[PDB]
Design a binder for this molecule. Structure first.
Ligand SMILES: CC(=O)c1sc(CCOP(=O)(O)OP(=O)(O)O)c(C)[n+]1Cc1cnc(C)nc1N
Ligand SMILES: CC(=O)c1sc(CCOP(=O)(O)OP(=O)(O)O)c(C)[n+]1Cc1cnc(C)nc1N
Ligand SMILES: [Mg+2]
Ligand SMILES: [Mg+2]
Ligand code: NA
Ligand code: NA
Lengths: 544, 544
């Protein structure tokens, strides 16, 4: 009577092994149907997880998780893994607050061998587990599932070199859905049909106990209102994403400046560069999932007179920290960073929240940092960055902004804030996403000033000296960690001016933020409009 | 009458081309002699530069620098490059303050195509220059010299993938001195004799104008008081490097704790692990020049119950920022970081000064940060780190400390500072290298307290509340940038306690520090003993 008679009896991998191999194809058909029925919601990596159903079924049929360790790279392809490991009932609330993560998470289950979200980490983790295993006299199996895209990552390729050097027992499954390792010293098997679960089982049985590292190359298939040219995605009629504002802006700019060259690390759609790549094909570069290569290639362009734009998510820019510091900042090169997904991104959780860029970028000499309040101010920053010396970073959140007409290119002096609401008793300093909350919080409140602190590096020391000298209390708000971010920048400046007003630093706490909506995270962090109103009341302002 | 009749007439590459090819072997003999005579000083990469004399001679004989761009990876092997490009007279003062850099530097000469010091950047820079070249209608040559070691770096391997993808004109010389690229899509030539300058010229002439990227694989030879078991180097009889203190410490510790596993990214000697690798061969790992792999492999060990120790220089830890954040900190893993070369390192200049770790580590949740004042306190921190949950970082400078007897393992509570000199009027907060200056500065001065702020994360909030509440002024000193470091941490804590004393944040300015002794840099930065005395006088303390 049920659509999934086999899955209904499978509560874990030890129930899976009770089936016959001839029943595994029928199980893979149930798993694809289950993934579609429950995970056809918005913003779910449906195609990748569907493509990996057969390899995950065969791995759990052959190996003995949780004693055997199965590692997924990125982790977006492991919905069938979660379904087969006692989390079938939780798939309906995946990525929701209080539910299971969209990626594998060590805290979530003994079956999740690594916490992942960033790509290319599985191989180095697997090597560490294999080395620890041999240092403990144990012989459990270590297996890693890495896609063709993740394999291009630098830390995946380097780890391959070391894995072939140590010669320890481990299995690497290359999940290749885009339709050689002799110098590494690694056993190579394949390519084989990545959707033949019975054939996959046969192979894994006869590979998983061999000596030394092995790569099993499998081939799988990817996925077995108003239009937006930037992201190539249809959006609400009223919507206008920051990614789309950037895409339109840089597409316009490049029409008049042939020095502009846009580099992305395999995120053309997310960063909003679909239209750009078609209008300016001689000025668009995709370096794969290698943020390190994106920034240093841009530096090489800047050395030869170009004005490169690195489009990159805040969380991924973390991968290129040293390239920003060493390859860009030391010679003060003309690299512009347009940083999408700044701040809390929400449902993707701790591995993707970009709440650190105002901290690690700020400590790099010469790197200017700006936060636009709307699309016009984004274009002003982009125009300034593309026409002045040295590196500039422009960070904006995931979300929408007001659409601006073409040809809007204001002139702004970099480093100048702007007062948005009069008032000198309590003054709130906030830029970007935090500024939305601040204006909302102090909307009616007289004497509560609001300043668009749209530049984090440098600060507007003139306005901060004037405001800090006469304000009773200051409130800094940032979609960033409170440690070493915009709040710390204000305190460093005030102290060096020997100004000592009361200051309340509002931001993300020194704690990783689990998956949940950004509105929920900002409410619990204390930066949304009601929480700012609470701080205003603790400071003695009459709040309703 | 002169030892170098040929070199005496060579003031630049256009004079080199006037020679006959039969004179090039004699020139390479002059260049080796010149490098030995002038660069046989202390701490110079003599062997690497000697090994690359023939390839550098042939490249400059064939190419037309500065219009042609020759890129060196790391840059330690390019002494003959500097000699052939008008800097022969400056080799006597190389790495000295006011002299030329030990590596290539764009600011130094039009012949230095990239500023380097960290490894594996040449390939991505070369790709950017080649892309910029083609985007400008120009046809100059782009050539990169990368060693076998640098080629194992992740960003070198990933860049190789993209270089083979773009198919642009460029030459990569693999300088292989440690005695395959079909999937990349790159032309492969070699291996050839890397010391046959005439044969090298012949090849470069017939390769440098071909289409697409080419790899020229050459084979070269590496280098054509009391003993210290840690670094394997003889040192002054009274000396005792921090690297040697760490090596002895972890060698002792691992004898009693089999969970301890030491990972280094190809810096066994510098980190002081020569003896360790011989006493504990089943607990020592070398991952090549891949800091990214070192940290994530350690995370994989920590997931399997081990207590890994990542030994790594502060400047190189910058390469593993995201791996510390994403792979270690998110699940609060038991990874201990022993961070050598913390602070200003001196003669190696801007590419090596480790003055950022107290800033980028501090913004990562759960990462504890300690600064030992001597070897006993280092062992106390190492013992604490290896027996408590979560990640810990321990940073120490290049330099010497007092030698401690074996079996010294004090118990310290992590997060507790210690008052070293009484006094409550002005209190100086300083740890590690900065604490040496502070104790020196306030040695005789009564009422000037000195606190060993040996923990940056967390701060000793109890002592800081007491001291900040009653002190007239505070002075924070750190061998770190003043932006977001220990000074900012103190200000963030004081502000959240609503304590507003006068504070002077002393540290490295928000500017890269050129090559010079650490004593000179600290004097100009304002953290040495006389500069602290100057700050004490500006605060009203009677100073001699
Ligand atoms: C989920 C996410 O954020 C993904 S999934 C993905 C492509 C992976 O390709 P692969 O072949 O490995 O798998 P496939 O798409 O299923 O075929 C990227 C670039 N990203 C973004 C990204 C960017 N950069 C880094 C360091 N990590 C991630 N996860
Ligand atoms: C100079 C310096 O700091 C060197 S030279 C070197 C070995 C390079 O091997 P290669 O084969 O490329 O050249 P060779 O030794 O001459 O044979 C290392 C690891 N380091 C330290 C180091 C560590 N990590 C990084 C990112 N960069 C550097 N420069
Ligand atoms: Mg793929
Ligand atoms: Mg070498
Ligand atoms: Na610029
Ligand atoms: Na620990």
């Amino acid at each position: 009577t049920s659509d999934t008679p086999l899955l209904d009896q499978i509560h874990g991998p030890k129930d899976l092994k009770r089936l016959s191999r001839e029943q595994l194809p029928a199980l893979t058909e149930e798993l694809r149907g289950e993934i579609v029925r429950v995970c056809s919601r918005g913003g779910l990596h449906l195609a990748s997880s569907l493509g990996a159903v057969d390899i995950i079924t065969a791995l759990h049929y052959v190996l003995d998780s949780p004693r055997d360790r199965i590692l997924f790279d990125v982790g977006h392809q492991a919905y069938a893994h979660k379904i087969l490991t006692g989390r079938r009932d939780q798939m309906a609330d995946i990525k929701k607050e209080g539910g299971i993560s969209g990626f594998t998470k060590v805290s979530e289950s003994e079956h999740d061998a690594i916490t992942v979200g960033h790509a290319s980490t599985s191989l180095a983790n697997a090597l560490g587990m294999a080395l620890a295993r041999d240092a403990q006299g144990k012989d459990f199996h270590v297996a890693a599932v890495i896609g063709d895209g993740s394999l291009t990552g630098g830390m995946a390729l380097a780890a391959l070199n070391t894995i072939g050097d140590m010669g320890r027992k481990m299995l690497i499954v290359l999940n290749d859905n885009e339709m050689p390792f002799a110098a590494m010293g690694v056993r190579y098997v394949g390519p084989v049909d990545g959707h033949n679960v019975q054939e996959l089982v046969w192979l894994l049985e006869r590979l998983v106990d061999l000596d030394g590292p092995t790569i099993l190359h499998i081939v799988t298939t990817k996925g077995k209102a108003k239009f937006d040219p930037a992201t190539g995605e249809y959006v609400p009629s009223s919507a206008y994403s920051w990614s789309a504002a950037f895409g339109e802006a840089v597409t316009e700019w490049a029409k008049t400046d042939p020095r502009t060259f846009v580099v992305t690390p395999a995120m053309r759609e997310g960063s909003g560069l679909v239209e750009f790549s078609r209008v300016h094909p001689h000025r668009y570069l995709d370096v794969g999932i290698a943020e390190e290569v994106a920034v240093t290639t841009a530096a090489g362009m800047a050395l030869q007179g170009m004005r490169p734009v690195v489009a990159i998510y805040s969380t991924f820019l973390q991968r290129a920290y040293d390239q920003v510091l060493h390859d860009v900042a030391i010679e003060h090169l003309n690299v512009t960073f347009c940083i999408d997904r700044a701040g809390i991104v929400g449902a993707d959780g701790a591995t993707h929240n970009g709440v650190f860029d105002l901290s690690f970028l700020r400590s790099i000499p010469g790197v200017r940092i700006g936060l636009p309040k709307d699309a016009a101010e984004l274009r002003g920053m982009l125009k300034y960055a593309q026409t002045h010396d040295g590196p500039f970073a422009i960070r904006y959140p995931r979300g929408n902004t007001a659409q601006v007409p073409a040809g809007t290119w204001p002139d702004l002096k970099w480093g100048e804030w702007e007062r948005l609401k009069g008032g000198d008793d309590v003054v709130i300093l906030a830029g970007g996403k935090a500024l939305d909350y601040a204006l909302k919080a102090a909307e009616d409140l007289p004497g509560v000033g609001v300043v668009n602190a749209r530049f984090v590096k440098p600060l507007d020391e003139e306005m901060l000296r004037e405001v800090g000298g006469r304000a009773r209390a200051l409130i800094t708000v940032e979609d960033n960690t409170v440690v070493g971010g915009f709040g710390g920048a204000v305190l460093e400046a005030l102290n060096s001016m020997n100004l000592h007003p009361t200051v309340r630093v509002l931001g993300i706490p020194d704690e990783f933020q689990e998956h949940a909506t950004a509105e929920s995270v900002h409410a619990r962090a204390g930066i949304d409009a009601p929480a700012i109103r609470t701080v205003l009341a603790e400071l003695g302002v009459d709040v309703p």
